């Protein structure tokens, strides 16, 4: 209702473009698609850009 690209990026995870009646349209970079919630971005290909896909799991002991 009150949603706008000027405030918190329209709640879009990546990109926002204003739509009619103080609604936005969210969108994603190449290799991602919009999630169910129409806000978040999820991979649409196997090795999408900008994603670290190898576990960084590490730990410091004494």
């Amino acid at each position: 209702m009150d949603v706008t690209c000027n405030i918190k990026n329209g709640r879009c995870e990546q990109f926002c473009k204003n739509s009619a009646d103080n609604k936005v349209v969210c969108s994603c970079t190449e290799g991602y698609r919009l999630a169910e919630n129409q806000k978040s971005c999820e991979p649409a290909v196997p090795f999408p850009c900008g994603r670290v896909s190898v576990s960084q799991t590490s730990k410091l002991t004494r």
């Binding site: 995870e13 971005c41 900008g50 994603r51 896909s53």
Partner: protein, 235 residues
């Protein structure tokens, strides 16, 4: 990188290393399977450069490395080293044969001009490379990384006798000790946004490395994204 840490394998899967007359002389970033973005001062039309993706330790074999030849070098059309060595410090390398993307060889995302700048203004990015680990010191064997804060433009201008152009930005630490360095040029300054990394800068230049009151200077990628997208399009 001075004062950084060793990367983990796969931590920076967009990072490449350039080998030429000198090995590991510069870095780069994967734009897509056929294209690398790097610094213009690193390269020049016709000198033999090879790119290695999937690299971690430059003296050992990890069996994740992908080595490609460069078929075309495209320095930005505004770059002119005879006028200024570091203005418009950006170039594209076309690989002869595509990379095969996987967890160790993944492109960096590149947003539009507006969002690139929005991302840069978050104010914290990661730089990485196999450059010198001290000013005039030894280079790294294992890929190094460092988080660097964005430095206010006026602060950066006051720090130097040199000219910082609008297509450059400053990042680093006032107290010194941590910075990109010789041999890191061309590698990525990236900003992580909700878990996805976007290219925000190219490692470019500085006055020594890691000295107090001096900053690293970086090519402002937002100024070049249309050109990158147009030159590198595969479809």
């Amino acid at each position: 990188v001075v004062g950084g840490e060793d990367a983990k394998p796969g931590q920076f899967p967009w990072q490449v290393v350039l080998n030429g007359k000198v090995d590991a002389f510069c870095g780069g970033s994967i734009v897509n399977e056929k294209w690398i973005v790097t610094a213009a001062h690193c390269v020049e039309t016709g000198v033999k450069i090879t790119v290695v993706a999937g690299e971690h330790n430059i003296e050992e074999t990890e069996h994740t490395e992908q080595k490609r030849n460069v078929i075309r070098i495209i320095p930005h059309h505004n770059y002119n080293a005879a006028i200024n060595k570091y203005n418009h410090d950006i170039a594209l390398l076309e690989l002869d044969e595509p990379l095969v993307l996987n967890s160790y060889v993944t492109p960096i995302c590149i947003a539009d001009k507006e969002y690139t700048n929005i991302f840069l203004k978050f104010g914290s990015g990661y730089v990485s490379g196999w450059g010198r680990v001290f000013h005039q010191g030894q280079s790294a064997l294992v890929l190094q990384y460092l988080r660097v804060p964005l430095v206010d433009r006026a602060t950066c201008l006051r720090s130097t006798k040199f000219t910082i152009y609008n297509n450059m930005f400053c990042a680093g630490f006032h107290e010194g000790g941590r910075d990109s360095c010789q041999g890191d040029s061309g590698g990525p300054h990236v900003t992580e946004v909700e878990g996805t990394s976007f290219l925000t800068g190219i490692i470019s230049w500085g006055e020594e490395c890691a000295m107090k009151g001096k900053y690293g200077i970086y090519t402002k990628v937002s100024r070049y994204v249309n050109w990158i997208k147009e030159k590198t399009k595969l479809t």
